[PDB]
Amino acid sequence: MTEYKLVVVGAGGVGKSALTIQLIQNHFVDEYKPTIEDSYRKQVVIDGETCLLDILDTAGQEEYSAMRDQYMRTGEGFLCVFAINNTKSFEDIHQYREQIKRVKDSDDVPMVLVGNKCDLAARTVESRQAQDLARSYGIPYIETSAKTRQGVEDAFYTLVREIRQH
Ligand SMILES: Nc1nc2c(ncn2[C@@H]2O[C@H](COP(=O)(O)OP(=O)(O)NP(=O)(O)O)[C@@H](O)[C@H]2O)c(=O)[nH]1
Ligand SMILES: [Mg+2]
């Protein structure tokens, strides 16, 4: 069966791990257990396709940008995560995207943009700003909350759709 190699990137604490764990383990981690790196997989169904989703959950905590390089090479698709309550994380997106394009030596890498933490009243990034940012990338935008699981499958699964149509 098709294995899809998803990698989760984005600034420190936007909810990369929470998204992955909600996807994989169906529980809200509810803890900044700052990541070093973690590999997960789950057999899932996407558009009727039973497939495997491998998720490489990466340390956004930008002290390991050089660890990220070698490790991202492996990924086929990338979830670019910010938190809708952290504009600095939204600005940080350009960097992660650029690095990924660098690493894969391609302007057109399967990717999605993810605004996480949409349960939070504290929105500082408009949905339309992120939709526009994704559009400027020619990639999907998904809004999620790892807390409530709202949009979580959508984020990883829409990235599978990117990998496929690539
Ligand atoms: N309310 C809410 N909180 C969230 C959400 N996602 C993550 N959090 C919380 O915010 C904190 C940071 O989440 P985490 O998943 O560790 O961030 P990260 O991007 O994986 N961290 P790093 O790059 O260092 O590994 C945790 O307390 C976590 O429970 C969300 O969708 N909603
Ligand atoms: Mg993490």
Q: In this structure, what CATH number is given to the domain that contains residue 107?
A: 3.40.50.300
Under the phi-then-psi rule, with left for phi > 0, alpha for psi from -120 to 50, and beta for the rest, what region is 9?
beta
Count other C-beta atoms under 10 Å from residue 81's C-beta.
32
Write the burial class of residue 111 (CB in 10 Å: 0-12 exposed, 13-18 middle, 19+ buried).
buried
Structural domain count of the chain: 1
- Method used experimentally: X-ray
Domain housing 84: 3-165
Evaluate whether 93 touches 140 at the Cβ level (below 8 Å). no
| Residue 151 phi, psi (nearest 5) | 70, 0
Find the 146 Cα to ligand 1 centroid distance in Å.
8
Count other C-beta atoms under 10 Å from residue 73's C-beta.
12
Q: Distance (Å, rounded) from C-alpha 110 to C-alpha 113?
A: 11
Evaluate whether 65 touches 15 at the Cβ level (below 8 Å). no
**Cα separations in angstroms, 143 against 53, 111, 156:** 20, 14, 11
Q: Distance (Å, rounded) from C-alpha 55 to C-alpha 40?
A: 5
Resolution (A): 1.8
Please give all residues whose CB falls under 5 A of ion ligand 2, grouped by chain where several chains appear. 16-17, 35
Q: Which long-range contacts (CB under 8 A, 24 or more apart) does 125-132 make?
A: 125/82, 125/84, 125/85, 125/86, 125/87, 125/90, 127/84, 129/90, 130/82, 130/84, 130/90
Q: Distance (Å, rounded) from C-alpha 128 to C-alpha 106?
A: 26
Of 21, 31, 32, 67, the residue with max ligand 1 atoms within 8 A of its CB, to mutate for a pocket test, comes to 32
